[PDB]
Amino acid sequence: AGSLTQLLATGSMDAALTQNATRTFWKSSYQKHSLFALESINQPFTTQVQFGAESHITVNRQGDLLSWMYLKIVLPGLKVQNQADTVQPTQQSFASLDNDVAAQADVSHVLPYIEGAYTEASLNTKEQLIAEAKNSYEAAKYNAAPLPVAAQMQSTEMPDFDYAYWTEAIGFHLIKRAEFKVGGATIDTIWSELLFAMEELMGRAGRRLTETIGRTLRRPTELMKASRQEQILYVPLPWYFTKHPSLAFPLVAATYHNIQLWVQWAQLNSCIIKSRSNLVVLHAERNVPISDDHLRASLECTYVHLEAAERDALTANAGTQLIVQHQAHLQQVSSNNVTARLNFNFPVLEFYYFLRRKANKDAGDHFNFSGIGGRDPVVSAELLFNNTARVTQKPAVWWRAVQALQFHSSAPLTNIYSYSFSLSPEDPITPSGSANFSRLDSVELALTLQDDFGAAHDANSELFVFARSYNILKFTNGLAG
Amino acid sequence: AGSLTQLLATGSMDAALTQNATRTFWKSSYQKHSLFALESINQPFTTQVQFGAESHITVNRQGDLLSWMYLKIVLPGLKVQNQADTVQPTQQSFASLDNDVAAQADVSHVLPYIEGAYTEASLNTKEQLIAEAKNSYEAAKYNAAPLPVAAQMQSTEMPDFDYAYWTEAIGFHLIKRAEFKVGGATIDTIWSELLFAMEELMGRAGRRLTETIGRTLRRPTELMKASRQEQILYVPLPWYFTKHPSLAFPLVAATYHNIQLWVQWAQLNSCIIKSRSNLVVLHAERNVPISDDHLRASLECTYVHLEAAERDALTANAGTQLIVQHQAHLQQVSSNNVTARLNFNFPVLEFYYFLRRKANKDAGDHFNFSGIGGRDPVVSAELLFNNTARVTQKPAVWWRAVQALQFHSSAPLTNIYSYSFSLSPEDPITPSGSANFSRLDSVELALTLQDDFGAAHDANSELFVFARSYNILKFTNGLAG
Amino acid sequence: AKYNAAPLPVAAQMQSTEMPDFDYAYWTEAIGFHLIKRAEFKVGGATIDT
Amino acid sequence: AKYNAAPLPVAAQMQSTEMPDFDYAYWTEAIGFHLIKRAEFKVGGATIDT
């Protein structure tokens, strides 16, 4: 009686929701699709792959569309030997944990707050004086309550043996820059720092790229374990056509253009960290000093094979694809107040920004976007259009956590900040908002950074700003532009 | 030959799926949208913000729609001083870890199972006797196999120094109640306990509110670290209009109504836990006793700016929005059998329920919905409509884990139970089932709780029941109702 | 010999799983799946899925 | 009590099956059928009979 009465208890308001219902929950409807197949094919680079060099590949035409694209990287296992035991000790310098430049830079900021005879003190007494000076510095700069000295003395249990390892997220770090080219024109460009920021914000829970890029979430002991043997990494290249099947790049419609991936590789000296400064780093299998020719890479492409009728239709009329392109503003930072002039073009969906200390970069911690003592490097930021506040001054947590909560699949674990003009900037096919920067005379991101950011040992810290913008790729008569 | 043969190998069944295909995977189609912009604007409260008080804000009209809404809370850093060293030691009482009322309440239930001279025993002997009595209690009540005494002696390594910290998920706890008002009418009401339950069930992996609300997943050492300095929290207010862009609140269509947020704040005594009972809690920067006027809050609103044509269309005909409203049944528990009479109205989508021990509340652990000794407080529950079983008696795990698995984005880490009448209760725009409680003479949730729940030291434990219901918000002639 | 692996320090391979010094038995990992060696959904005596 | 049966002489109920005084194992009676818990005759993936 009650369940039937609920179906009868309808009024004029229910008519807007349920009158002439076009859907039922109790019967499945499905759509028929055209026939297609997927094939994954690995292809060698056209030029030699080496650390610090640029390499390119011309993408083969082994199907009708191009869908997924992965850079397959093979890194050798690492071993170490004392320089005294080596017949040829001359190698490039690597970052070493016995010379922690990041910790030395952090100590340099607290030196003015050390009370007593620091120079003559025992090692254990120096560690105590540094922890007390950190409390005095943080009280003076941040009105922070002092932490117990014992809580600041975190011994990272480092192993009592010699090692070397590939840096955190080495699969991204290796790709300093990649360019997707069609007919000799650059269609899009991606950077190591952008790839990491995109994975932090858009990386879905349970599908994080951890193993696929050599990322351990800053657990040095796991990087050491992984680095003792050969590593095979599959780094996704997040081009517009890899984001949705309807955006797959129509190879058949671009028949008269070569499709190329160009990759600028990281220098070998930046890719490795060692336990001690006096160690030589060896290729684990070959027992020779590690060299720039030990980088191996290939391109793994997923091709789509279409039925003849769909292939012929696509060849006759591929039309236009909405694309997202990436733009970059890279700036050196030498002051706590920084203004970035964002000379980006087109309808910008969103931008990302973050800072890297010089000391973190020099320590080989390339994706450590933290400030001094691991703090947030940004105090506040403001966004100006033509000297008018588009976003008034907001604290770092608003740009990092509130913007990520509103517009992104994930909140960043590092100090990555974002701002979206789009309601759904991760939707590759549905435009949901933008600001046209080609119609603004000035776009300025004004930053107030933490105290002493870009001073002394951190002179030439880096500001990264990346923007995502809409453009249109047109296919006509076997050409793409 | 094989791939072409697959495209030809079609029969009368494939016609229902692929005949006259209206979609291709090999060409992207996109829709054009109207022009809009988003702006985030922070606004002060119209009244003073203080602990234990009620404050309100009249929301400004700085755009055409209202989308996201965050309560920006600023909490001072905490320090502690001995009461003997303080010129004015008189402060409100705070929960203290040297007086663990929750542990004392748990011990009180096992006192009848302690064999031997408990009163005269050494401290280490009392801990042994309590662990043995816990085994005897659990064997007698639950037919549990005894755990090794050493496995029950979990020392939480508490630091050997003085501290105070803000309670777990303080950003939610501060909001005892918030009311969204339009034209003086309450449109919706949210509670601290509901906000936490909603984040447990609907909080997406990689987008949990942890840092944004001061939640550490019950790691006291992280709460201590965070509480030594100023904290800025961004608490999302999950109103119907924050759930989907098409539900954004049409400011232009409600021109003659004031839009107000009212917030009832938690008492300061409930917000802080200290290491010892004899400590005074100080504002870390000001070096004064912490007081009710040290709470700071503001409202951060995201406005939408529309193109004139869409703004004019929305002003002429905003029509009606489907809304979800929240209802609450709050009850004291003094017996293991509890019947809650759910006097909720309208088409209910779903309800949540959970229990809080008096001892957990008094210990300042406001979101600890566990029973005695951290067990599940519910043994079983039944749902009755007009004294007829709508859901027959089911064990706690069915209401907690099976209902969450079927209808929610996440399973709760705490003892939160749910039941959905909707197939997709997290879809804000598509009704997918409901029960109309305004047409039921009685709705009863009958609970069988664990033994001794609501007895002795847990007299006046709390039952929370929250329901989500459909209603319609109508916009006409510049008014909303 | 098999993988050209660099040697790990012997101390890093000696992971003591701290097993409790008392007697116990337990149900195997993911016992809810392990219990179901096979399930068949049947309609009218025909197996629709396994 | 159950069947109103007349009592049988106790000696007629004491049937010793002369079991051999040695160790053995054997396959159960009609093992050829017992082995076949179920058989299905299928054509084109459809079960025609079971």
Length of chain D: 50
Q: Is B376 exposed, middle or buried (0-12, 13-18, 19+ CB in 10 A)?
A: middle
Per the CB < 8 A criterion, the answer to whether A475 and A318 are in contact is yes
**B38 CB within 8 Å of a chain A CB:** yes
d(CA A255, CA A242): 20
Among the partner residues B228, B236, B423, nearest to A405 by beta-carbon distance: B236
CA distance A56 to chain B (A): 26
Reported as half-sphere exposure (CB side, CA atoms, 13 A), residue B22 has a value of 3
Q: Which of A172, A292, A281 is nearest to A228 (CA)?
A: A281
C45 touches D: beta carbon within 8 Å: yes
Smallest Cα–Cα separation from A196: which of A366, A27, A371, A57? A366
Write the residue in A30, A143, A402 that is nearest to B77 by C-beta: A143
According to DSSP, residue B60 is labeled P
Q: Long-range contacts of range A428-431, CB-CB < 8 Å, 24 or more positions apart?
A: A428/A240, A428/A243, A428/A244, A428/A247, A428/A322, A428/A324, A429/A244, A429/A246, A429/A247, A429/A322, A429/B28, A429/B29, A429/B30, A430/B30, A430/B31, A430/B33, A431/A322, A431/A470, A431/B30, A431/B31, A431/B32, A431/B33
Chain-chain contact of A423 with B245 (C-beta, under 8 angstroms): yes
Helix (H, G, I), strand (E, B) or coil at A74: strand
Alpha-carbon gap, residue A63 to A304, rounded angstroms: 6
Q: How many whole angstroms separate alpha carbon B474 and alpha carbon B182?
A: 12
CB-CB under 8 Å, C3 with A159: no
Q: Give the distance from residue C38's alpha carbon to the nearest chain D alpha carbon, in angstroms.
A: 15
On chain D, the residues whose CB falls within 8 A of the CB of C46 are: 46-47
CB contact under 8 A, C6 and A225: no
Chain D contact for C44, CB < 8 A?
no
Contacts of B322 (CB under 8 A, 6+ apart): A17, B240, B247, B428, B429, B431, B470, B472
**Would you state the torsion angle of the CA atoms of residues B177, B180, B185, B186, taken in this order, to the nearest 10 degrees?**
-40
Residue B151 with chain C: CB contacts under 8 Å: 20
Reported as type and span, the H/E element at residue A130 is helix A123-142
Distance CA B170, CA D21 (A): 81
- Identify residue B120 by its one-letter amino acid code: E
Contacts A412 to B, Cβ<8 Å: none
**Any C CB within 8 A of A225 CB:** yes
Is B4 within 8 Å of A308 when comparing Cβ atoms? yes
Partner residue opposite B33 with nearest CB, options A397, A401, A432:
A432
**Distance between CA atoms of B169 and B73, rounded to whole angstroms?**
12
Helix or strand (DSSP H, E) at A163: none
CA B370-B375-B380 angle, 5° bins: 90
CB contact under 8 A, C8 and A228: yes
- Identify the experimental approach: cryo-EM
After which residues are there C–N gaps above 2.5 Å in chain D?
A: none
Chain C residues with CB under 8 Å of B150 CB are: 20-21
Tell me if chain A has a CB within 8 Å of the CB of B26.
Answer: yes
Residues whose CB falls within 8 Å of the CB of residue A121, separated by 6 or more in sequence, listed in order? A129
Task: For residue A477, report the phi and psi dihedrals to the nearest 5 degrees.
Answer: 50, 40
C26 touches chain B (CB under 8 A): no
| Spatial CB neighbours of B198, under 8 Å, sequence gap ≥ 6 | B238, B352
Contact (CB, 8 A) for A164 and A80: yes
CB of A281 within 8 Å of any CB in chain C? no
Q: Kindly report the nearest CA distance between residue B145 and chain C, in angstroms.
A: 10
Q: Is B9 at the interface with chain C, CB within 8 A? A: no
Six-digit token pair at B338? 């509890």
Amino acid at B300: E
- Give, in order, the Cα–Cα distances in Å from B258 to each of B169, B190, B233, C44: 31, 19, 26, 64
Nearest to A161 among C4, C5, C9 (CB): C9
Q: How far apart are CA B130 and CA B108, in angstroms?
A: 10
Please give, rounded to a whole number of angstroms, the shortest distance from the CA of C32 to a CA of chain D: 26
Which chains does chain D touch, 3 or more C-beta pairs < 8 A?
Answer: C
Distance CA A392, CA A383 (A): 7
| CA neighbor of A310 nearest in space, from A80, A33, A84 | A33
CB neighbour class for A126 (10 Å; exposed up to 12, middle 13-18, buried from 19): middle
Alpha carbon of D18 to those of B114, D14, D22, D29, D30: distances in Å? 62, 12, 12, 18, 21
Answer whether C5 sits within 8 Å of A79, measured CB to CB.
no
Q: Contacts of residue C23 in chain B, CB cutoff 8 Å?
A: none
Subunits that touch chain C (at least 3 Cβ pairs < 8 angstroms)? Answer: A, B, D
- Residue B460's φ and ψ, nearest 5 degrees, are 70, 40
Query: Smallest Cα–Cα separation from B66: which of B238, B302, B243?
Result: B302
Q: Report the DSSP beta bridge partners of residue D43.
A: D46
- What is d(CA A411, CA A417) in angstroms, rounded to the nearest whole number? 10
Interface of B with A in 157-196 (CB under 8 A): 159-161
Alpha carbon distance B287, A56 (integer Å):
63
Contacts 24+ apart (CB under 8 A), D10-16: none
Contact C21 B148 (CB under 8 A): yes
- Flag if B151 and C20 touch (Cβ within 8 Å): yes
**Rounded to the nearest 10 degrees, how much is the dihedral formed by the CA atoms of B33, B34, B40, B43?**
-140
Q: Note every long-range contact of D21-26, with CB atoms under 8 Å and residues 24 or more positions apart, other chains counting.
A: none
DSSP state of B137: H
Residue B148 with chain C: CB contacts under 8 Å: 20-22
Q: Using an 8 Å Cβ cutoff, are B23 and A33 in contact?
A: yes
Structure-token match 């839009």, residue found: B259
For residue B289, the 8-state DSSP code is B
Q: Which long-range contacts (CB under 8 A, 24 or more apart) does B313-318 make?
A: B314/B64, B314/B250, B314/B252, B314/B253, B315/B252, B315/B253, B315/B255, B318/B250, B318/B252, B318/B253, B318/B475
Q: Are B315 and B385 in contact (CB under 8 A)?
A: no
Q: Is the dihedral of CA A122, A123, A124, A127 positive or negative?
A: positive
Task: Taking each helix axis as running N to C, give the angle between helix A101-110 and helix A123-142, from 0 to 180 degrees, rounded to the nearest 10.
Answer: 60
Residue whose C-alpha is closest to residue B390's, from A7, A8, A3, A9: A3
Q: For residues A371 and A350, give the distance between their C-alpha atoms in angstroms, rounded to a whole number.
A: 24
Beta strands B259-265 and B175-182 are: antiparallel
* B151 Cβ under 8 Å from any chain C Cβ: yes
- Say if CB B150 and CB B286 are below 8 A apart: no
- Strands (DSSP E) contained in A319-442 are 320-333, 337-341, 347-356, 378-385, 388-395, 417-420, 435-436
Place of tokens 């025609």: D48
Can you spell out the DSSP letters for D1-50? Answer: --S-PPPPPHHHH-------SS----PPTTHHHHT-S---EEETTEEEE-
Look at B19 and A6 and tell me if their CB atoms are within 8 Å. no
B217: DSSP letter: S
Taking CB atoms and an 8 Å limit, are B7 and A398 in contact across chains?
A: no
Test mutation, A158, A161, A165, chain C, max C CBs within 10 A: A161
Q: How far is D48 from chain C (nearest CA, A)?
A: 9
Work out whether strand B272-274 and strand B95-96 pair parallel, antiparallel, or are unpaired. parallel
Q: How far apart are CA B418 and CA B403, in angstroms?
A: 6
Q: Report yes or no: A153 at the B interface, CB cutoff 8 Å.
A: no
What one-letter code names the amino acid at B57? I
At how many Å resolution was this determined?
12.0
List CB contacts (< 8 A) between C3 and chain A: 229
Cβ atoms of B106 and B100 within 8 Å: the answer is no
Provide the 8-state DSSP code for A285.
T
What are the residues whose beta carbons fall under 8 Å from the beta carbon of B299, sequence distance 6 or more?
A: B42, B43, B44, B45, B57, B59, B69, B70, B71, B72, B261
Which of left, alpha, beta for A20 (phi over 0: left; psi -120 to 50: alpha)?
Answer: left
The C-alpha atoms of residue A297 and residue A290 are separated, in whole angstroms, by 16
Question: What is the phi/psi pair of residue B234, to 5°?
Answer: -120, 90
